Design a protein around this ligand. Sequence first.
Ligand SMILES: CCCCCCSC[C@H](NC(=O)CC[C@H]([NH3+])C(=O)O)C(=O)NCC(=O)O
Ligand SMILES: CCCCCCSC[C@H](NC(=O)CC[C@H]([NH3+])C(=O)O)C(=O)NCC(=O)O
Lengths: 209, 209
Amino acid sequence: DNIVLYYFDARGKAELIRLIFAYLGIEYTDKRFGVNGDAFVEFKNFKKEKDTPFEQVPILQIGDLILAQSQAIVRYLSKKYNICGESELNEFYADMIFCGVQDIHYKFNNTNLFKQNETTFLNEDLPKWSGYFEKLLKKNHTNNNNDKYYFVGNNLTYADLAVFNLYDDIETKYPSSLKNFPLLKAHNEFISNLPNIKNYITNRKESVY
Amino acid sequence: DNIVLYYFDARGKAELIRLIFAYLGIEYTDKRFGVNGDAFVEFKNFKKEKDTPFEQVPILQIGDLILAQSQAIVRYLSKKYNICGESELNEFYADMIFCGVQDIHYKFNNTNLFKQNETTFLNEDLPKWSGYFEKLLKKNHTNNNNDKYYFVGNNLTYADLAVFNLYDDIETKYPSSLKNFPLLKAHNEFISNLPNIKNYITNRKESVY
Ligand SMILES: CCCCCCSC[C@H](NC(=O)CC[C@H]([NH3+])C(=O)O)C(=O)NCC(=O)O
Ligand SMILES: CCCCCCSC[C@H](NC(=O)CC[C@H]([NH3+])C(=O)O)C(=O)NCC(=O)O
């Protein structure tokens, strides 16, 4: 019943978990390797002290329970705290959308810092994937038109937070990315303004990734 | 004419070229996109005004001559200014070493920052590749012992500078990485203390990569 999240000092694959905790107002210890200096030694000492299944982070520890694999952690958390949808179909859709997010998020990460194929990403990959998500929001649109935007049903799911996080990452590095996608831009403003998320984000230190 | 080097605000693909210019004492303009605001917009405006063969940087402009492709630029510069060996065979060896540096450099860049496969990089690939270079260094032993270390022949080549740049970069992240490779470490210290290089490095700005 004591909750601790371990990861490096970065958003990366731990950020959606932090967002979920913030949304749900669950208190926990956000352990970031390297805050005490020397990320290498901490992570090394961490693998000695804790029984990780694949020697990787994020690791979420609940009391004595070691949980690994960010995706599995996200899905487990979401079922326990009721943001995994209201039906079996919607649970699937939230899941499907989260997997879609992983596809572009991966590409975004591979291009933003190194500028690797930045032009191809910004001209082909990004608008195509943003178009996919725009169309999903649209298919779910008259599930609350009153400035509430959800990808799945009439309630918030981890998919909303996952898409938020993704486009939160993208519009900062690439301002006005959302301008051609009105539903997606609105969705990003909506969830970003939810008080718990609004407070987490303003309190959130800047980071390289 | 005026030499202008065009790249993003980073070491990456341009640094070796800058090291060659520093080493040779060649004056040029080091134009860096995105020093002040969003590199992608500046790069976009650059391609509109400049005819590049592949719409990518680095670009080296000498007069109205436009040169693209970092590796080809290095070789051209190195042949022009006599740091490419002194026999057809040593010219090949410098080239071979450079290509080897690119294999390991790519791995270091792909795993540093994100930590994707860090322990694989650290316990397998880096030591392996460090051993390759150490071994190549030993093979050039007769090409003196007199506190001078070269990979090829008995004069500095761009391969020396490439290997330097490779471990200068790695040593930032993993500072003890050359403790088991004393000849490689001495090599690295020797290059870094050449007056033109020492000077360029002290004055060099810090970067994420
Ligand atoms: C933008 C984020 C992309 C970067 C991915 C790297 S996350 C850090 C890395 N862990 C993983 O790759 C975990 C992947 C796993 N599939 C998950 O989702 O948790 C690690 O423990 N690294 C330490 C090591 O391998 O030694
Ligand atoms: C760790 C450093 C390695 C990062 C690789 C990307 S360097 C920037 C990129 N250019 C290239 O990929 C050039 C590759 C070419 N083979 C070279 O070596 O010059 C670019 O112009 N990008 C802009 C664009 O595609 O729009």
